[PDB]
């Protein structure tokens, strides 16, 4: 695997510093390098592809080297290496794609492909190079056991969930009482509702609570709390929780009193945020708690105390919310995030070349489908699977 | 049962003797953990 | 660590191979070993202790080589020796002791004290030897990222949970039908009671079905099931769901019909036996589900149809249920079971010197709090402390 | 065959004893025993697998022998080492597991699969060395014919059985005197009920009698003997012995009288116990017979006189039980137990491949089955088969 | 003594490592150990027996030794060899059983046999070797005045106990309260009932508890506490503790309130747990005492309010209890368990032989009899016996 990487770093660093006038001495530690592997490889015979739509190329090995000498180089020179690239680099494309579909239920953590097998083979790991890429970087500080860890903007933990619960309901659905959500990626979105507005509640309050629980800990979480959910801040007809009717939902917004949000570990708070809102971090975490209650308000002008009568038809349904955002994390787990393509990498290389479904991952790598089933076995496979794509992007875009 | 499968300073420890408020407030109040049952069975035994 | 490991089975095999009589020739190897050993140390400095109720004591070295000359042992020889040991001995104690309290988040798989992070160095490593000790045995395999495995009679894999769900009730509590369980250890016991005997139900026979979710895969397990479930055999006076009253149980017993236990792992079946009792093995899984049936009798003696009246009061409450044992099985992670002493040499050396409750592990090692919040983090600090414990029994206990 | 153990041995005293870091002595006798193997190995070829789902893989060998570079070990000899050893292991696992699911009725002792039959062959005895492991001791034994013995803890020699006999009945069974039990594993729990508590017994006792037979003798059991059954202690609705109906039972339970235990040999009574409960040693037996009796109280309170009446109806039937546990004995066949792993490594193996079912073994490995018809074939094949799982568990868990 | 161990390991050692096949220099070590026995013992005449139904046996040596030549062994290398062997067995079994029998009120830890005594001789020292049998072991460290130490899953600290105890009891046995129990190896259950429900009874509570007294100290135990005596569960017909009549326990059961279990030392709380059930640990303890209490339930449905009138007749029985197992614990002083075969072995010897009764042990080595008087000498003989157990184990089973 490792061997993989080297393979590519050593284009690019290639591709890059090989150009029409250069100086040598820039590139004799890199030249090196390079011939190296050509030996390695020549008297090498390899096979990719075989599955789905996916065509079955060979290949084979037999190159000359690169004169070390000249002060500068010469057009001539890159022309004569370039046409030698073209065919390694044609090579690699079709050895990450054939490597990034096959799927392991027992060690889906180890190479799959014909192809790499054979590269883990010990005569070829006399290429290896350079692993600064902070995928690979992650990969081995794995492999010794260890803690490894990555870096996501707007990372996307939450499988997507879009639901109600009716605290308090009737068949009329004309005074309910309960919290309604959005959870999705980042973004968590919860509304409190209750169409009595108090009225007949302990101090006129009505208490709240969201609990969302991660799949895998997140630390070092950048996060933006806001009051409200202006998703559900607007007149909704939804469907009754058993699918037979419609009720009508009318919200009228007052500010959350008493928000405390928790972010527990194991049961344990590790942050606490009394009606803080703006930027907050929590540092460690596998779960997050939101509480917030609606308080009648004691005080009403004639405008406001016209919208909550002491008696049914309720019309206007009291409803406070709140918006959490996690914008960074850290996860010593891969997870697909707003600015890294590599599960649209791997989920693009699958669908171009029609791979079939296989025993690992949902159909069509769904996000959702996977993060909410996240075992060790998915997790092993997209890491390795993420992996490739990392190596692959470094030269292929 | 509390010094063992917990911590106990030598500080606190020589609080939680004279039964200090403060350093009793905490615990119950804090950690939660057996204090809240000592406490507790207590209050349950002012039944009367 | 391993370094550590071998300090032991140095001593163990030392205490033991050398005594008054015994021919050079069987201990050459050992000999050597050891000497080896005196030297790489002679010259360093130590600490141990200092965290909670925990005597702080300090070691130095310089300590004479041994008679490689001699053909037989004579008593004098011994004694000379066993004074060198008894430093050691009273030496690792101390050290098992000072870095099987320290718990940590981050990495909480390497050490921890400044005793043990000191040998991990390079220079001291020239001492390993003989790792047949199962349980260092598997703490190597794991670092080399490779499949482990642990035996255990009576594993410890249920946290303490026993509790009812009432699938019918009224506030009378007087035609309740439902479950009850206790999973504990390695056992379960469920039953499922239906006070009206299946009276109005399809076929006069009611489901029951109860799951238990592992924390951890089991494999190998070797497994005793039998009928009835004991436990709940017999008048009860329970506290209702929401503790504001008490139900009344007076329980009969029948044959649990179509009893149907399935092993299953991430969902899929992997074993599945029906109806039958005695000992059976499930090879690997992750969940059991146990499903059974209360069938009313279609024939009944006078005596017997008289408990069961058409109408309430229902006096004699029809009960079905199961038994189930894991009296053997392996796991990839360390668990408390019944004969292994780990868990609790861990638990009494916190205990006995006061050791403050820590980041990582529940207060008191709570088993029933770990397992049921069994964390990488626990699990990892875990591991290296029953490793530790184990290498201590090698030579107090 | 005694060839295949060593080469494990070999193994892990390999995988263990080879470390960055010990001296070259402690290992000179082993290094030794090693190369002399892969010398008589190198050349030969060998055939796995061809069985259900087990695959046919090839191995052959071609490897150069071990360096001895001087006073202890550097990492690099180490890596060149395992990775010779990882061939043999994933080697010998193939090899288990091929020769762990053949059976054979006319000579199912010996070695079956094409891959251990080439090793009983001559040129390879040089290896065998340290038949040090319990199950090796006892295969060797046997082979010169001797006295062999293996040790069990919740032995499990009763196969499951839970039935009753009437010995008194009547159509509306309102008036029933017999015995009911529960055989299974290492335990035994009998009860003997009379409904009309010897109202009209001779001497008002009531004479019960459990008698189970084993299929092999066990000698050295340390055995719990307690009074009462508490799996009959308690109310149940029971099929009667034609099925046509089900009766009622409704158990008051008194001391059992006159308890005597008997451990017979061939007819004989090699021990007896007079009413003994606690912990008993019974040395050598192949029949257990449990006598006790039921004597109708000859002083009752009031509360209990209204329990047993002159006349029917009987309402409350009078029950005295035993409960008797095997919790360690010795036994000269291999049988399972609640700590060993071998019936559920050779099951788990079995089930895992779809191994078709054979002619000697129950379908499932049954283990009720199997101890039920324990023919000499059956003991001979479970014992090669259980004496492979051992020799796998060295190296693999 | 430890002369008697090497013998063995000698020979086990030997009848394993010595195979047609294996390299000599993988016994070289080994062989020369060996030949120095029979020297030392050329030329000694000894005598076993004497006793009971115990044969007088007797023994002469008159050996030659073995070859040091041939890379590898044959056949005939081995016949010649265990010819020799077989002499020493069946010599040992002799030697063992012998000292296995006599008892001696004073030095009790001394050898006793003309057989034995002869051994302790220094001539004769020249043969020790190898003490790594746990039991050896402690042997040693015991003899130099140190500190001991063994391990037992399901230990056997209970002398047999099944009894009662009426706080409050009348002439008619209508209205009892007090506690049943039993006390049984590694197992306590105990029952505390009030015939009254706690109706007169201060806050509705009856009180109970029972304390159990260890006859030694268990360190490092694991222990499972659960909730109820299923036991004493069910409808018992018991004599009265005059045994002139009997009376009527008809319990139903109530969860036990405010569960207090404390394992002293000495007088001193070193553990308690309050409530907590499931797996507990208890480090050092030389007393258990269960406390519990029966709450008159405060809310009662009808079913429930049924069961406990204002005023007698007393029908339903309230009762409250607990269960405690010991599943594995340390001890300094040797005790038997569910595991080791050592008790049964030594009674087993004994039985076979017909010895007649001596002044140190019970009749029939009673295990109740044997811990609840379990004296110094008592003490010394069993771990002298039991130690000799070990031996013999080693090479006969
Ligand atoms: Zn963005
Ligand atoms: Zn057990």
Same mark, same amino acid.
């Given at each position: 695997?490792?061997?993989?990487?080297?393979?590519?770093?050593?284009?690019?660093?290639?591709?890059?510093?090989?150009?029409? #006038?250069?100086?040598?001495?820039?590139?004799?530690?890199?030249?090196?390098?390079?011939?190296?592997?050509?030996?390695?490889?020549?008297?090498?015979?390899?096979?990719? @592809? #075989?599955? @789905?739509?996916?065509?079955?190329?060979?290949?084979?090995?037999?190159?000359?080297?690169? @004169?070390?000498?000249?002060?500068?180089?010469?057009?001539?020179?890159?022309?004569?290496?370039?046409?030698?690239?073209?065919?390694?680099?044609?090579?690699?494309?079709?050895?990450?794609?054939?490597?990034?579909?096959?799927?392991?239920?027992?060690?889906?953590?180890?190479?799959?492909?014909?192809?790499?097998?054979?590269?883990?083979?010990?005569?070829?790991?006399?290429?290896?190079?350079?692993?600064?890429?902070?995928?690979?970087?992650?990969?081995?500080?794995?492999?010794?056991?260890?803690?490894?860890?990555?870096?996501?903007?707007?990372?996307?933990?939450?499988?997507?969930?879009?639901?109600?619960?009716?605290?308090?309901?009737?068949?009329?659905?004309?005074?309910?009482?309960?919290?309604?959500?959005?959870?999705?990626?980042?973004?968590?979105?919860?509304?409190?509702?209750?169409?009595?507005?108090?009225?007949?509640?302990?101090?006129?309050?009505?208490?709240?609570?969201?609990?969302?629980?991660?799949?895998?800990?997140?630390?070092?979480?950048?996060?933006?709390?806001?009051?409200?959910?202006?998703?559900?801040?607007?007149?909704?007809?939804?469907?009754?929780?058993?699918?037979?009717?419609?009720?009508?939902?009318?919200?009228?917004?007052?500010?959350?009193?008493?928000?405390?949000?928790?972010?527990?570990?194991?049961?344990?708070?590790?942050?606490?945020?009394?009606?803080?809102?703006?930027?907050?971090?929590?540092?460690?975490?596998?779960?997050?708690?939101?509480?917030?209650?609606?308080?009648?308000?004691?005080?009403?002008?004639?405008?406001?105390?016209?919208?909550?009568?002491?008696?049914?038809?309720?019309?206007?349904?009291?409803?406070?919310?709140?918006?959490?955002?996690?914008?960074?994390?850290?996860?010593?787990?891969?997870?697909?995030?707003?600015?890294?393509?590599?599960?649209?990498?791997?989920?693009?290389?699958?669908?171009?070349?029609?791979?079939?479904?296989?025993?690992?991952?949902?159909?069509?790598?769904?996000?959702?489908?996977?993060?909410?089933?996240?075992?060790?076995?998915?997790?092993?496979?997209?890491?390795?699977?993420?992996?490739?794509?990392?190596?692959?992007?470094?030269?292929?875009? | 049962?509390?010094?063992?499968?917990?911590?106990?300073?030598?500080?606190?420890?020589?609080?939680?003797?004279?039964s200090?408020?403060?350093?009793l407030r905490?615990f119950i109040n804090?950690?939660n953990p057996i204090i809240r049952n000592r406490i507790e069975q207590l209050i349950m035994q002012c039944?009367?």
């Amino acid at each position: 695997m490792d061997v993989l990487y080297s393979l590519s770093k050593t284009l690019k660093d290639a591709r890059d510093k090989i150009v029409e #006038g250069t100086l040598y001495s820039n590139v004799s530690d890199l030249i090196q390098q390079f011939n190296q592997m050509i030996i390695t490889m020549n008297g090498n015979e390899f096979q990719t @592809g #075989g599955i @789905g739509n996916l065509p079955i190329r060979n290949w084979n090995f037999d190159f000359g080297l690169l @004169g070390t000498t000249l002060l500068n180089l010469d057009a001539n020179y890159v022309e004569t290496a370039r046409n030698t690239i073209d065919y390694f680099v044609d090579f690699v494309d079709n050895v990450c794609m054939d490597e990034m579909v096959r799927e392991s239920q027992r060690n889906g953590i180890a190479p799959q492909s014909d192809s790499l097998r054979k590269l883990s083979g010990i005569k070829f790991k006399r290429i290896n190079f350079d692993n600064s890429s902070e995928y690979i970087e992650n990969w081995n500080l794995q492999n010794r056991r260890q803690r490894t860890g990555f870096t996501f903007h707007k990372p996307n933990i939450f499988p997507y969930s879009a639901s109600f619960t009716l605290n308090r309901s009737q068949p009329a659905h004309d005074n309910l009482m309960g919290t309604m959500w959005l959870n999705a990626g980042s973004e968590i979105q919860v509304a409190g509702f209750d169409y009595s507005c108090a009225i007949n509640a302990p101090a006129n309050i009505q208490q709240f609570e969201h609990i969302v629980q991660l799949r895998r800990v997140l630390t070092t979480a950048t996060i933006t709390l806001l009051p409200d959910a202006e998703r559900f801040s607007f007149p909704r007809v939804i469907n009754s929780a058993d699918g037979a009717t419609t009720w009508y939902f009318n919200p009228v917004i007052l500010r959350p009193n008493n928000v405390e949000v928790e972010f527990l570990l194991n049961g344990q708070i590790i942050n606490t945020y009394q009606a803080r809102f703006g930027t907050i971090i929590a540092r460690n975490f596998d779960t997050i708690r939101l509480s917030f209650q609606l308080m009648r308000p004691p005080n009403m002008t004639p405008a406001v105390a016209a919208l909550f009568p002491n008696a049914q038809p309720f019309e206007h349904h009291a409803t406070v919310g709140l918006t959490l955002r996690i914008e960074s994390a850290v996860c010593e787990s891969v997870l697909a995030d707003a600015s890294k393509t590599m599960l649209a990498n791997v989920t693009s290389v699958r669908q171009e070349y029609a791979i079939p479904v296989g025993p690992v991952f949902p159909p069509g790598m769904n996000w959702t489908d996977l993060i909410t089933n996240y075992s060790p076995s998915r997790e092993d496979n997209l890491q390795r699977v993420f992996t490739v794509a990392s190596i692959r992007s470094m030269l292929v875009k | 049962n509390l010094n063992d499968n917990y911590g106990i300073s030598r500080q606190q420890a020589f609080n939680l003797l004279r039964s200090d408020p403060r350093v009793l407030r905490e615990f119950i109040n804090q950690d939660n953990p057996i204090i809240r049952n000592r406490i507790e069975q207590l209050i349950m035994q002012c039944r009367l």
